Amino acid sequence: IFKPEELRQALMPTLEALYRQDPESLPFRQPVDPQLLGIPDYFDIVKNPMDLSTIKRKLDTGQYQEPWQYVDDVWLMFNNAWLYNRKTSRVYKFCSKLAEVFEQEIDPVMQSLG
């Protein structure tokens, strides 16, 4: 069992590492609005959307019961972007950079938790 403050203290640095990536985190900081972005086909392909602001709010307000729920949401965000965007596209490459950063950061944090 995990207290929400314990999860926030341990996991927020891994999320901050993603936010720190500029420009690579810019497609992921807010939820995708297909109308604003001019990609109205998005929700036909991405049925379970996820973004950094949602993950941050969940961590801030205690909505995760255990750390693998947070890890699941981060990977859901990455997988959505790799599914929707073409392999040669800017956003796909940005996602791959974030995933490389996350893999480096999450491993020892989960070991300390556990």
Ligand X SMILES: CCOc1ccc(C(C)=O)cc1-c1cc(NC(=O)c2ccco2)cc(-c2c(C)on(CC)c2=O)c1
Q: How far is the CB of 80 from ligand X (least distance, A)?
A: 6
Give the one residue of 27, 67, 70, 73 binding ligand X; rule: CB under 6 A: 27
Q: Which residue shows structure tokens 């403050």?
A: 5
State how far the Cα of 26 lies from the Cα of 108, in Å rounded to an integer. Answer: 26
83 part of the interface to ligand X, by CB under 6 A: no
Among the residue ranges 4-12, 37-45, 62-70, 103-111, the one whose residues contact ligand X (CB under 6 A)? 37-45
Among 62, 88, 75, 65, residue whose Cα is nearest residue 14: 75
Beta-carbon contacts of residue 82 (< 8 Å; ≥ 6 apart): 92, 95, 96
Nearer to ligand X, 30 or 65 (CB): 30
Cα–Cα distances in angstroms (integers) from residue 6 to residues 22, 60, 113, in the given order: 28, 11, 9
Nearer to ligand X, 10 or 76 (CB): 76
Dihedrals phi, psi of 4, to nearest 5 degrees: -60, -35
Q: Which of the residues 39 through 58 are near ligand X (CB under 6 A)?
A: 39
Give the one residue of 9, 13, 30, 60 binding ligand X; rule: CB under 6 A: 30
Residues that bind ligand X (CB under 6 A): 23, 26-28, 30, 32, 37-39, 81, 84-85, 90-91
